[PDB]
Design a protein around this ligand. Structure first.
Ligand SMILES: [Zn+2]
Ligand SMILES: [Zn+2]
Ligand SMILES: [Zn+2]
Ligand SMILES: [Zn+2]
Lengths: 199, 199, 199, 199
DNA sequence: GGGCCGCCCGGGCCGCCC
DNA sequence: GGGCCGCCCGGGCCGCCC
């Protein structure tokens, strides 16, 4: 079987969708999402709010998993990992393994997983329904390397795959978005959107 | 009996066909398929996505085998192997014999076979139906020598033969395409397509 | 005492001087020395010939040590080391510690030392007089990181300090030159020489 | 000490010089020497006559050694060897190790040596004075790879170093010349001589 | 917010076929 | 002897300094 997780959108029985904040485009804004590109632009280690929307509430014990894969076919097989420089940096929260690219901040029940067959990394939190009167549940992700990091992503674009799963790991829903971790998310979003409109 | 495997197209009971991505034509693109030539142009060791399409799902235990043979009659008899230089290069994935031209990346159940009678190499993975909502199953192949390699293919064109087989080795379907492994797949595809249109 | 080794030129009793080949200026030449800047421009891991000239022959047991220090006052204190990415690369010659920036190739008696007090790296070979009829002795050095390497030199210029020492470590002579390890030594030498002439 | 043998010309006590036949420049002549370049152009495995001239006769037991080194500083450290393809070719004379680039044909007392410290290859024959009435002693060398061989010389020019030595290995004399092993020695000699006269 | 170094890019330069 | 594929080449395109 393939060692590359599927990226196919699957809203599933609960109508699972992702939402992103309306952020702006100042040159070095910490995080900003492009709907035209379905692509998040963000700085290293900064908060990236991701909204979980459902049409109906999934059962208790539902989990939310985030995992990165390289976007290009030529690189899908390679596990996405932190580069050796940032791996050795003293910046662990005491829970996230230093090799993991994606973290979750502000959650008491975070789990960091290494797949036993594919060796891919992922980070898991329990699914929580929105507060009564709220439309969605917001998770704060962090990406611990720039897309450009030498010896790590090395300028290769990645996708983040968000899955809703039961406690057994069965797929309840799946969505994805592209990520660029860079120094100037506002400049780069504008550049990439202009290259899109030009072509 | 002939030691040269058949290349005859056979869609079979399950309507087996191959598909290829719409790739582009930049001078040194890593992989690009020419429908006019039914020919894949790719760089050494780079990802070559090949799509498996069926009209109906073959049974569990079905296998997908890929094998290379020289295209020209004068060379069909000779086993396709890596050249001595690349055979000795430390580029093994720990599974593929260093002599094998064709590898599969990103699959946990890959097998590398040497025919006991013909000594030809092949690489096998289990057939997997596409995800629900997907049209095909994609396999990532790698070719570990240039077509031009001295002491190996030595500028002789090859065919890749893809067979659908049951677990006993019975034939369920067969397709094939020409392969050129080269430094500049975009240049060489254009050159060969132009020579086709001129002739 | 200072943990920063002196860079002061000292020709000493034997008239110790350095010489460099007349190299050229093509964009990506592997190594080229600028007399205007007393600066070597070279590519990662490529041969850097350095000539040892003396007015008279030092005694047997003389050693030639090479050590790097950061040029700028702000960085002199920090030990010059390879970055984490290149430290983990499998490029060791079986002798050079993976942390050492400077190597010597083609010498059977090379030693790699870590100072017990300052922890600075250096590489040592025996001094050999030139062949009869030759004017100098040539050593081939290699620099195993780019000056720009993240987590290593990180765009900070270095000096290479070459010392002539007796077997006890007493100083017999000392010379030095600036080094930039970069992808395009010819481009960068021209750029820096033009900035010199303009200023 | 350096693992790179000296190439310095040393006529020595016996006035040791090399001579080469006047050959011509037909496109694919098997061997032709350029005095303007001090460079031999020859085809793979073909006879390359090399003349040994002395002003006076060296003692009995004198040996003649030929050894190849790469000409460019960047490659001097690497041992010159046959490529993996020609190494596996069944073309040994029963004496020459398949890895050795340089052979001697037509000599009953040929020795093939692998240096115990540098691992460099060489081929040795006894020195013989010319016949009475003859001016020189001619040795027939063969080069068993093209300069272009992938995984071997890989288009890097080499020097052949010819040394006169006593039975102990002491240096009595040394000369050298560049070698290009190629398919068309006449064409390539003319090309390289024209590039010389142009510049 | 303006603007200043590794790597990608298309042009074009040696064994073998004719 | 004429002439037809991997690799070298100079132009030019993302973190950090200002
Ligand atoms: Zn990083
Ligand atoms: Zn090969
Ligand atoms: Zn480095
Ligand atoms: Zn060869």
């Amino acid at each position: 079987s393939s060692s590359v997780p599927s990226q196919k959108t699957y809203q599933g029985s609960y109508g699972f969708r992702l939402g992103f904040l309306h952020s702006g485009t100042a040159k070095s804004v910490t995080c900003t999402y492009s709907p035209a590109l379905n692509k998040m632009f963000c700085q290293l280690a900064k908060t990236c709010p991701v909204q979980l929307w459902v049409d109906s509430t999934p059962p208790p014990g539902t989990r939310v998993r985030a995992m990165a894969i390289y976007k290009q076919s030529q690189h899908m097989t390679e596990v996405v990992r932190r580069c050796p420089h940032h791996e050795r940096c003293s910046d662990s929260d005491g829970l996230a393994p230093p090799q993991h690219l994606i973290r979750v901040e502000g959650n008491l029940r975070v789990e960091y997983l290494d797949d036993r067959n594919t060796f891919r990394h992922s980070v898991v939190v329990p699914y929580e329904p929105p507060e009564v009167g709220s439309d969605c549940t917001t998770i704060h992700y962090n990406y611990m390397c720039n897309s450009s990091c030498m010896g790590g992503m090395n300028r290769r674009p990645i996708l983040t795959i968000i899955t809703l799963e039961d406690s057994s790991g069965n797929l309840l829903g799946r969505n994805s978005f592209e990520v660029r971790v860079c120094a100037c998310p506002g400049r780069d979003r504008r550049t990439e959107e202009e290259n899109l409109r030009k072509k």
